[PDB]
Design a protein around this ligand. Sequence first.
Ligand SMILES: [Zn+2]
Ligand SMILES: [Zn+2]
Ligand SMILES: [Zn+2]
Ligand SMILES: [Zn+2]
Lengths: 49, 266, 259, 49, 266, 259
Amino acid sequence: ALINMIYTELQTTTLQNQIHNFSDFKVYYRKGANPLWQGPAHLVWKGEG
Amino acid sequence: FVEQIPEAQEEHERYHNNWKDLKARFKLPTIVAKAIIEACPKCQVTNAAVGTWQMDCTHLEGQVICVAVHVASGYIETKILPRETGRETALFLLQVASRWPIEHLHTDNGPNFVSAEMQATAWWLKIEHTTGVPYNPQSQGSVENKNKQLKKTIQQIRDEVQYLSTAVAQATFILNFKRRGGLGDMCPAEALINMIYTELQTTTLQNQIHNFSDFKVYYRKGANPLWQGPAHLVWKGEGAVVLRTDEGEVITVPRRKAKIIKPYGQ
Amino acid sequence: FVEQIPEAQEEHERYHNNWKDLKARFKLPTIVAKAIIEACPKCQAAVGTWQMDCTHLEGQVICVAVHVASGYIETKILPRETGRETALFLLQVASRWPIEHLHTDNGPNFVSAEMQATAWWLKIEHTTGVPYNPQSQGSVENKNKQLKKTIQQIRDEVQYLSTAVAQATFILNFKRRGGLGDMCPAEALINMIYTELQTTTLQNQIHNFSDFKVYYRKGANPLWQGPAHLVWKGEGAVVLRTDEGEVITVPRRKAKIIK
Amino acid sequence: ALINMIYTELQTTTLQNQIHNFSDFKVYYRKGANPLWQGPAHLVWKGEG
Amino acid sequence: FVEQIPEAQEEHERYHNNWKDLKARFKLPTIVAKAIIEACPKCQVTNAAVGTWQMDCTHLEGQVICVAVHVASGYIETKILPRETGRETALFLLQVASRWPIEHLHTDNGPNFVSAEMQATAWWLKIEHTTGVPYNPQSQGSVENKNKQLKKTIQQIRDEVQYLSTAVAQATFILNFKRRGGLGDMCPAEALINMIYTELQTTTLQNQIHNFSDFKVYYRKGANPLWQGPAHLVWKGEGAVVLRTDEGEVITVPRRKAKIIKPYGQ
Amino acid sequence: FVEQIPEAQEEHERYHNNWKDLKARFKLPTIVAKAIIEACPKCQAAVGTWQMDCTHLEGQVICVAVHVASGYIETKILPRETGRETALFLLQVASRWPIEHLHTDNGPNFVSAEMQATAWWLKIEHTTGVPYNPQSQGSVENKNKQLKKTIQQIRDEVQYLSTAVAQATFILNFKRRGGLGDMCPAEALINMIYTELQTTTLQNQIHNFSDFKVYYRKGANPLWQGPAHLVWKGEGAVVLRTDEGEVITVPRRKAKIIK
RNA sequence: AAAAAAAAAAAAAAAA
RNA sequence: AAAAAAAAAAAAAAAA
RNA sequence: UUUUUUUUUUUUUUUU
RNA sequence: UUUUUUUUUUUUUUUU
Ligand SMILES: [Zn+2]
Ligand SMILES: [Zn+2]
Ligand SMILES: [Zn+2]
Ligand SMILES: [Zn+2]
């Protein structure tokens, strides 16, 4: 179990660092109470909610 | 920048660069670079797909030189064929395809470019072998210019090198790495590497998504000590992780309450 | 990297890292890493490291050059095990990918004058014998074993040995995926080359700092201190090292440089 | 002349510091090449150009 | 917060505050503050304009107490009138108007609130003296509540104070500064100061604009060494100044190239 | 104000400023300024400072209280020059505006027991004699002269002296504008009171830090250092002073507090 | 779709 | 109104 | 595990 | 005063 956790941590870190400057479907978001739009930012997951 | 004047000259003794490369490397003004270029007695002054290559053959000193030229960037590769036959051309195509991704080959209608060996080799790699006049004359002009420049570099270099193959290899090195090009001020090899890396962005994203679709995460929500899961992993951060449960909800869990496991099964 | 210069130095105080590791972890220029490693009295896998070795199969000599950091391989059937043929192979390899370091065993062909002349012409650091890097001591042997293993799977439906060698090299380079990233050797090599190209474009090299002397105002002391050697001249700040061995970044307004 | 310059510097500093958190006609602006709107910011001067 | 329990009690010995003030000052919870308030034997548990004031008179121990109450905030002022007459009321109105801005006075229809002295005093200060039932009953209710609270505080304090005037002054101080109010949890004096400061924002802006319309600035544009101007000043910054020339252009000039002068003439 | 604590200290090393000046310039809390001045071996205009004085006119005594920092004045006709009347006037003044410091000459009425009792009841730091502040030594005399000057312009069209005094006070407070800002005394006083109220609301006072001991980790030394007195406890960082006399702000993660 | 009020959930900082 | 190219003006940083 | 400050979400009610 | 990097403005031309 310990070996599995260490290996999966290493693999997740490597895979996340593999893609850092490119994505698809750049989007704009509104953060907090500020009505001003912000971005563009990379899209990680698009969901119904 | 006068202190760089001697050393740069020494470089022009070994690699016969152009003024653009010297200016970009030693941060020299254009006028002095052109003067340095002219001081040497042996010196004067497309939008195809990523996987498009052309092939050609030339005769020099009773030897056959086969040249494969990238169309978009200008990267070239040269070989000394023993005898002009379909087998040698097929072997050279196989050797070239074992180093760079080839998806479309253009060539003339010569006798050795139509033999059964050529067809078998092109079918093994699953590439489109086109014979005839290219659709865009710009590619043909660029290939002819590359061949002429290669011949000029052989003429410049052969005096210092005893054997033809070594001179051809040195000329290929000089053309690929020393002399710069047009837009972007990049060497042909650098441009080819940049284009290939840019083309390989979607596949890595798809592979990352497919791999992330495998990890499982067990999370603790609120003050309830009982663990929950398993759930699909969406992203793992330094402070907190973002998960997508089987019901479609998106949940942010602190790092101290999430455990990520990749099972040996499946 | 104003806040990175001290902390990185602290690392060299504890674990005694190398300058290459310092560049890899802290994204620092080579000059500041060299200054840091030279400051310490105790001290006195890259993108351009290759390893070349020969092998025999069916009475034919095959020379293989392997990139240690990615696993990319290149093979050539040498007519004879002579210095000229191996030097020509090295020249051909150097004309495609950037080579900055070559390592090979102590064989007679790798010691001949042709290899030395080619290495001098290409400006390549060539070493022989025991590898200085603790790791990568058996990557080439494993690659040779793998190539020999995959050659047999295709030798049946193939006439000439050269075609089989080319097919095996193509399959090894492109049709097999590794671990810890899931990338074939060609993709990993291209990614590493692209990253190194971006870093070197940012660096622009061409330092020639020589032994320029620097007087600096440290803390609230108004009197000039030093003199200290110049390490890095930047528009926003200058990085210097003192005779004691401390690396300090100071703003330009409190730094007087004498040639 | 020196006394006049010193006095006018002091008066400008004091008058500017008097008003620092209120104004009229808050405006939105676009800075540089970024098309995203920004603000709101206090209006100091409105002109034709 | 038990260490604050004794000291706070000592405060309630001198100033008879309420639980809100003790909670806001000593950061005590509501329950313990209410307990402290109940422990004392002598203790139990509008949108008008900024310049709106009301006046009233009360009789206590054979003395006349005149009370002026702010409507919006609840700030009060008290005086001991020697004899109930129009002259004394006019003098008290003048004294109140010499400390705070008064723009509208609401009073009753009494005999001493209609004498010629009151009319002359209200005309001198240019204020609107309204006599009769106020339009909003909330203001009248608040004034009556303030008067009742003043009477209660005077009754609480009189045991420890010899003379009536000192007791009235102490009660006024306690009402104005000690006991807190409603929205915002502020004392009446703090609320009045905040409202007055908020109301005085446009006038300061206009005065600043008028004063800035006087300074002159001489500026140097580009590499031309000849000075230029004079021009109107728009803003002065730590790094650069922004000027508006007579032709309407807006120019940013570095501080080293601008000289600001305010002439003695005009 | 992490970066403001050292620099401000440097000021006290050079010009030996006061803690009030430190608060005015660096916007620092009173406790840290007191710690800074106490740490120096050499060392051992506000919103609530008033000055009260009496005068005579037409056989009537007029008492005037002046705010030194703005010029706001308040006048009252005292029936007699007794201690009780002046104490009542001070109590009335203190019930309208916040008073934290009262200064007056050495007159017999200002020394009587009634004034002391009133000052004790109101918790006012009452001082007499030579003013400790170098300036403001003649503001009250100038204000008295100005009041006597302006009362004559209105005494003609007025019957009773009290009405003239009230009108003169109103004219001086509201109908005359000063210099260096162009603000009448009432506006300046209100602005100063508002700014002080905002600052005190931000401060919230209630420190009671006592003599709690603090062990701190400074620089890269792993061993505990101290013990040092506690100056300010903040969520993000803690400000402490050492026995040597150095004020340092450290993050909470490297601070251990013993009561 | 925006504002206000009441209730519920999670996270960060702080004291124990 | 947006993109690209050529020319002109100002400011900041750096060397002299 | 308990309590304060801040931030991000869900439900109900009152208006536009 | 001269030369490089970056930023902010004005004019002309080619398309949408
Ligand atoms: Zn040449
Ligand atoms: Zn070391
Ligand atoms: Zn009580
Ligand atoms: Zn001192």
